[PDB]
Amino acid sequence: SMKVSRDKDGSKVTTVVATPGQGPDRPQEVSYTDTKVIGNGSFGVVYQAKLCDSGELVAIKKVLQDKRFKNRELQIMRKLDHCNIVRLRYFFYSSGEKKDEVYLNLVLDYVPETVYRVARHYSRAKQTLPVIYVKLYMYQLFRSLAYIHSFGICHRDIKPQNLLLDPDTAVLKLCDFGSAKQLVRGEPNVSYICSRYYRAPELIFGATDYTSSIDVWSAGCVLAELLLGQPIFPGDSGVDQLVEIIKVLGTPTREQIREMNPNYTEFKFPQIKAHPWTKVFRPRTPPEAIALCSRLLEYTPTARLTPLEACAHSFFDELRDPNVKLPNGRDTPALFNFTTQELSSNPPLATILIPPHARIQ
Amino acid sequence: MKVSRDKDGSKVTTVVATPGQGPDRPQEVSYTDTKVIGNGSFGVVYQAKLCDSGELVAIKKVLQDKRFKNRELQIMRKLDHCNIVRLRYFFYSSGEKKDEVYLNLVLDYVPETVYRVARHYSRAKQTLPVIYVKLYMYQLFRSLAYIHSFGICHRDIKPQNLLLDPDTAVLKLCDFGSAKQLVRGEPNVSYICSRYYRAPELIFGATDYTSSIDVWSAGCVLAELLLGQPIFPGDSGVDQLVEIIKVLGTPTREQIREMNPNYTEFKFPQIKAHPWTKVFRPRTPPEAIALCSRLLEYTPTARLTPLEACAHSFFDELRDPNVKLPNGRDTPALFNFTTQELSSNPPLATILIPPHA
Ligand SMILES: O=C(NCCCCN1CCN(c2cccc(Cl)c2Cl)CC1)n1c(=O)[nH]c2ccc(-c3cccnc3)cc21
Ligand SMILES: O=C(NCCCCN1CCN(c2cccc(Cl)c2Cl)CC1)n1c(=O)[nH]c2ccc(-c3cccnc3)cc21
The missing domain is CATH 3.30.200.20 (Phosphorylase Kinase; domain 1)
Structure with a gap:
């Protein structure tokens, strides 16, 4: 009643x-x-x-x-x-x-802006988002992914539309959980979740035994898009996206095929070597950002970084500098106030996650 | 060179x-x-x-x-x-x-495509005249009946792959990079076919599909030409299924078993069947609505064969001996069927080939 x-x-x-x-x-x-x-x-x-x-x-x-x-x-x-x-x-x-x-x-x-709308304004003006904002938005998404993964809950729909942004505070809040579901080992799940471009290869292959690592692939597809100004794996058909994946990652070995979808959907691909990841991005693209993309966009799902290991990557070292600020003057949002629920995937990772200056009495 | x-x-x-x-x-x-x-x-x-x-x-x-x-x-x-x-x-x-x-x-070389023409009438907020919807849909169905007679499935029917000669109203199917002979028993990949036009069994991830996935993709083109916009849009497979449940209603458990027998272990909301006549514009011809209802069916076997689609009452104006193009020319080749084309149903030649042929 209302x-x-x-x-x-x-x-x-x-x-x-x-x-x-x-x-x-x-x-x-x-x-x-x-x-x-x-x-x-x-x-x-x-x-x-x-x-x-x-x-x-x-x-x-x-x-x-x-x-x-x-x-x-x-x-x-x-x-x-x-x-x-x-x-x-x-x-x-x-x-x-x-x-x-x-x-x-x-x-x-309510949050006024989205990652999808921010990345477009820059893309439409033939420019890229400042890297300091790319570090902040990716880190906060990786923090939220580590939190929901600690409960076994996979978002199953990570796209720039679902990442909200307060442009003043640079705070990112993951939203839209209509595709989220707790993933229990042994239980099958639908293979038609997740929007295009950001679907993991094991999702394109129609696997039903996927883990929470599909969120890591989608997060890597967001980071690569903010660096390239456009989606890194575009395509109207699932065949079209897989071609663009081999264009960068290379032809998956028969072992990598078995690790994604063990059903082996019986398709023969064209053989193309590994595109040197540095040649994919702009000249002044930071080398650590290129290294993070390759560690997140892997065929073998178990080989991808966990969300907590992604936060401790060297690409986010600047966000741990004690003098780091927003370009508009304000401080950075809360980045080191983790919980024990958050470190539960790897508590020893707190030595890198919380930097020397945040442990001051 | x-x-x-x-x-x-x-x-x-x-x-x-x-x-x-x-x-x-x-x-x-x-x-x-x-x-x-x-x-x-x-x-x-x-x-x-x-x-x-x-x-x-x-x-x-x-x-x-x-x-x-x-x-x-x-x-x-x-x-x-x-x-x-x-x-x-x-x-x-x-x-x-x-x-x-x-x-x-x-x-x-063919100068235009169905996509460039359909995207354009929609931009002017007008619908393609039904005569061009009849000419384009019939020629597509004739091409699918041909390739299905060899067991070849196109597996990527979309308006961008339907070339158009605007003067002669000739339609030509192109792009066979996803084409493959579908033999019973051997599985096939489920990630073919473009968005908006994928069959329901494809989104569920089935590998035992038939050439009827081309008929579904054909039905998604016919409904697009009558509406002026994609009938089943969506950025994800979940989003496309929803737009299908809105129209076709919730599929029964027997329909799920015929699409993907694996049953991908999902529960869908129970929405009643949207009456097909309330999906389109008011003046939409009924035979066009009836043809769409026989192409966009859940169970793949219940969809019309590309030959049985050519015999539909919706294409009856094409068999009138006085039909002409809006620009004055005659209708292109529509009845020069071969024995290879009619192999899926030879008795359909009485309807497909009109008296004046
Ligand atoms: O979007 C927000 N602010 C942006 C200002 C409005 C302009 N937007 C432009 C973008 N658009 C959008 C994007 C993607 C999908 C869809 Cl369907 C839409 Cl409509 C939203 C409106 N949100 C907010 O502030 N709190 C929220 C809580 C939940 C949700 C949400 C989002 C998706 C699904 N389910 C819930 C969104 C917000
Ligand atoms: O496209 C044709 N004519 C239209 C020319 C201009 C009309 N628009 C111009 C712009 N265009 C366009 C724009 C961007 C990207 C792309 Cl990819 C395209 Cl197409 C749309 C149409 N073709 C034709 O005449 N004989 C053919 C034989 C084979 C194929 C083919 C195409 C793709 C895959 N496999 C076979 C295509 C044709």
């Missing part, structure tokens, strides 16, 4: 009773106004709303609630709490008119 | 090329005015003018694997159809050092 009303200046206000996203189930009286639609598609409509009291802007994801099972995104969103993940403030159920169908509303943090 | 010029400063290339059809008899062919008309993945496709007849030709220059012969070349030499681009000659050449051998496919 109560529609107006203010005393004629502005219209919706008042619902929602459950906090985290903490005890103590229902709340939330009132929002200025409801604009900010894009839809497949799952439903995502609105933007202004809270009546604090004046904060928020997003509302309105999807149709299956009366069978509870919504999977809601259950994963309620388990998460990370600074680089969009926060679920409240959630409530409602309807439209009749339909006799139940809609689930997800009240989440 | 012997590069040379003329006497007016034009530059002329002369190679020794084997005709695609007929017997192997390398010819001394010469062409000029070579321009790049697109590339991506396979290689660059050029355009040139034959030095004799002045005929425009398209040259597909891919790289040749020294192991196996090119599958696209062996398929090109077997095909000869009025609605398929013709491989006139083919020859090998290099490019600097590399030590790598390229294969050049001299194909017919």
Whole structure:
């Protein structure tokens, strides 16, 4: 149930009773106004709303609630709490008119800009994002990936559209968990998740025994795109993307084929040697960034870096410099305030992750 | 290849090329005015003018694997159809050092494609006249009925692969880099076919699919020409399935077993079947809506064969003896069927070939 009303200046206000996203189930009286639609598609409509009291802007994801099972995104969103993940403030159920169908509303943090929109503005002006921002956005994504992977939850849809950016604070928050799912060894999963360009080779080969490493490949496809100004593995068909992968990574050996999809889909590829990774990017592309891309874009899924090992890479050493700042003057966002839940994949990696200056009493 | 010029400063290339059809008899062919008309993945496709007849030709220059012969070349030499681009000659050449051998496919030049025309009416916010939808869909179905008679599946039907001669209204199928003979028992890769036009069994990851995936891709083109935009869009396979469930409704458990028998272990929301007539514009012809409902079916076997599509009531205006092109010309070749074409259903010749043929 929701109560529609107006203010005393004629502005219209919706008042619902929602459950906090985290903490005890103590229902709340939330009132929002200025409801604009900010894009839809497949799952439903995502609105933007202004809270009546604090004046904060928020997003509302309105999807149709299956009366069978509870919504999977809601259950994963309620388990998460990370600074680089969009926060679920409240959630409530409602309807439209009749339909006799139940809609689930997800009240989440509003973030003005996305990685996809930032990378385009630079691409449309024939320019590249400053590397300091490439380091910051990739590191924060790798931090969020290490957090959800510690729960076995794979995002299964890492694309620049799903990475939100506050341009003032350079804070990146991973969003859209409608494709996320806990991956248990031995259980099969669908091979048609993840958007194009950023699908892992084992996903193109239709494997159902993939791990959380498919997020690492998609993250490497984001880093390579921000460095190249365009997608590194483009293509309309799965055949088209695999050609561009062999163009850079080289022809996968029969062992690398077995490690991706052991089914061996029975296809013979053209033999092309390994494109020297340095020749792929611009001249002044940092060498450590080229090294990180090759360590993330590997055929063998087990050979790719874990999200925690990616954060400790030498490419992010500048973000650990104690004098590092944003170009606009402010400090960097929280980068070293990990949790024990976060280091659980490799606690000894904290020696590199938290740098000498962050351990000062 | 012997590069040379003329006497007016034009530059002329002369190679020794084997005709695609007929017997192997390398010819001394010469062409000029070579321009790049697109590339991506396979290689660059050029355009040139034959030095004799002045005929425009398209040259597909891919790289040749020294192991196996090119599958696209062996398929090109077997095909000869009025609605398929013709491989006139083919020859090998290099490019600097590399030590790598390229294969050049001299194909017919056709100025327009279905994509460039359909993208354009949509930009002007107008729909393609149904007469051109009938002419283009029928010629595509005739080409699929031909290649399916040899068991060859195109596996990449999209408007960008449907060439168009705007004067003669002739449609020609091109790009067979994903073509392959589908034999029962042997599996096939599931990552062929472009987005928007992939069959449902392809997105589920099936390897036991048939040539009916071309019929689904054909149905996705017909619905696009009636709507003015892709009917099943989406950046992911999950997003494409949703747009399919919105239209076709939730597939039953028997339909899932016929698509991908593996059952990829997913639960989908239960949405009722969107009435097909409420998907298109109001004045959309009913026989076009009925034809779409018989092409975009979940179970691959329940989709119309490319021959049974040519006999549909939607194409009845094409068999009227007084039909003409909007520009005044006559309709191109539509009824000169061969025994190879009608092998999938010979009794369909009573409907396919009208009295005045
Ligand atoms: O996008 C946000 N801010 C950008 C300002 C509006 C301009 N955008 C342009 C880009 N666009 C977009 C991008 C990709 C897919 C889709 Cl379907 C859309 Cl519509 C969103 C609107 N979000 C925000 O501030 N909190 C959020 C919480 C959840 C989601 C989300 C995103 C995707 C799926 N599910 C939930 C998004 C936001
Ligand atoms: O394309 C043809 N004519 C249209 C020319 C101009 C019309 N537009 C011009 C621009 N173009 C374009 C733009 C960007 C990229 C690409 Cl790739 C393209 Cl095509 C779209 C059409 N072809 C023709 O006449 N005989 C052929 C034989 C084989 C093939 C072929 C093509 C690809 C793969 N395999 C076979 C193509 C033709």
